[PDB]
Amino acid sequence: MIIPVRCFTCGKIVGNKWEAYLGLLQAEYTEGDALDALGLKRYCCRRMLLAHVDLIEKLLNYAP
């Protein structure tokens, strides 16, 4: 639904790299370069953003 606040495997906090991730992808950067530029070294953190599906943007579209 919404970005997890901390990575499940190592509790690294990834809940503040969602908008930065989206901004570096709009600038032309690959998902690899983008996840690198955010400080996500070990692949347990990289999967936390790489495979996130933001469904809070589709629920926030039905009437109040």
């Binding site: 690899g32 996840l35 690198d36 070294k41 070990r42 692949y43 990289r46």
Partner: protein, 51 residues
């Protein structure tokens, strides 16, 4: 002055309309076969040890 049976027909013709076959080219697929999954060029390590 009536109609009488005449001589038996000597043959029969059966007509049908038919078109012909073209050359065998056998063009199986636009982009054919199962194209293989493959390596992204260079790639580079995306991880390092500590120290």
């Amino acid at each position: 002055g009536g109609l009488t049976c005449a001589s038996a027909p000597q043959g029969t013709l059966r007509i049908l309309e038919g078109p012909q076959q073209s050359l065998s080219g056998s063009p199986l697929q636009p982009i054919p076969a199962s194209p293989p999954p493959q390596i992204p060029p260079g790639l580079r390590p995306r991880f390092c040890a500590f120290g």
